[PDB]
Design a protein around this ligand. Sequence first.
Ligand SMILES: OC[C@H]1O[C@H](O[C@H]2[C@H](O)[C@@H](O)[C@@H](O)O[C@@H]2CO)[C@H](O)[C@@H](O)[C@@H]1O
Ligand SMILES: [Mg+2]
Length: 535
Amino acid sequence: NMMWWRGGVIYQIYPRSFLDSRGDGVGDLNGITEKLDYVASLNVDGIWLSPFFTSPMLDFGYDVSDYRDVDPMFGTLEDFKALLEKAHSLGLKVMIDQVISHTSDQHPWFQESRQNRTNPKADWFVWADPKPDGTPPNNWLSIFGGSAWTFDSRRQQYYLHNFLTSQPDVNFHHPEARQAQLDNMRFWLDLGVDGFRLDTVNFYFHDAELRDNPPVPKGEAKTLGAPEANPYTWQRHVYDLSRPENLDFLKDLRALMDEYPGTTTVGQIGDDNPLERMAEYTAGGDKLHMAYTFDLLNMPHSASYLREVIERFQRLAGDAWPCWATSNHDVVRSATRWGADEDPHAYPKVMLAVLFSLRGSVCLYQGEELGLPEADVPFERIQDPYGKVLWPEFKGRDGCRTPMPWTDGEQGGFSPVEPWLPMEARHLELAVSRQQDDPNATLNTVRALLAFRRSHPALFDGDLSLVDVGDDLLGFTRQKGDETLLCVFNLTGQEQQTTLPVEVASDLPVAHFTATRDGSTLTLPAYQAAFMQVA
Ligand SMILES: OC[C@H]1O[C@H](O[C@H]2[C@H](O)[C@@H](O)[C@@H](O)O[C@@H]2CO)[C@H](O)[C@@H](O)[C@@H]1O
Ligand SMILES: [Mg+2]
């Protein structure tokens, strides 16, 4: 089945916070290998591993110094091969992150590049002369704070970095660099991986003319890939990323992926118009297989908003394929980000039902199946550098990166010592051991939802058609050939009622969800979901 990815569910693993098996407080590959049975018990189709490659860990993995090796803190290449084999033996696909838009400054490429203007790798990165007054070439801002340019005295030149200063951006306008990254991907492809999560996929190319970005009109909706307090949201990003040439490169990338049947790619979109960019990137069947945005990774979460997102995406290319995610290593956990003012146990269930019922692929973040809320990390335990620039208006991403609670024992059974990030007390209450045999628990709801999803083709890659179910409900039909399912969701803490826009043949029960269908009237209690078979 070469089309497993088109509708499949992927479980994201953040290597540093999954399981420590070496007793150093940091998660490693062998721990993941140890918990692959649990992962498979989740009824997911595969996994996505955040960067485990050689890195100074300034951005904790996303600042790579060696693309073709495992950082000794996570383990070895052989350990990864073992992980891959065990995951394959359990029927799990293995996707790994690929951070090719920027390297660490400790990467040999940049170490050679920064020496002068004539060295073999001088144009592998984005270098530019200062303005006559000595200031950066343009008004481009780094997401992690300050200018996107940093002066280097060896070359008398600013280098570009959309993120950390220790994360210089790769110059994709230089062909040999692009090809170098392609080969770096071919390495892992030859190892036998099942796919790649493409980090900052729309960031690859920049405007070679280094043109200034226009400011954002005051009172307009800021970009969804950054907090409000970030000055990065003050300007419209048109020249610093999302260049036309990128499309071409995508094709190239796709071609590489096409050399290995069964493989797939999911790109991370960070753009002013994310749905349009995703649809543009995943259409044609000759570029990205799929991609995800920040549309479901932000604050709005009502049925009206979800309807708006779906409508906005359906406006675009019909041959595009979205991947939907409500949580990851960059945002506040959905149980808190979306359901802070909702029921702690009831809301995540129906939210996950919605996520699993959307047309497209799914990214399920580690712990989200347990309904884990965001952890409040104290200032002296902050690890993420992004949490030290906008404090206290923005405290970084460490809250969603606290270690996985396997038991309610010491350190959640994550480590025999104090972990790199502290263990959340609330997470101990929602630990796997406490949750493994609880029928009312979120974990079993996830298992049942995914099993139910697996048993219905319409819920894999069927068409989605919105129906009028009212303001405070989310209703649509999923249709694939023989099957047509009516899906209605109540995301509120109140009982909702509606008249069925279509006629129903039967009810489809799943995971203790309860709704009453009397005549033409469907009634859903708080945080309940209703699946039905359309006549
Ligand atoms: O590797 C740097 C950074 O990139 C990714 O996230 C970015 C995203 O691409 C941007 O659009 C924007 O939203 O900033 C994000 C980081 O806050 C990675 O997912 C992230 O882990 C990494 O730090
Ligand atoms: Mg370890």
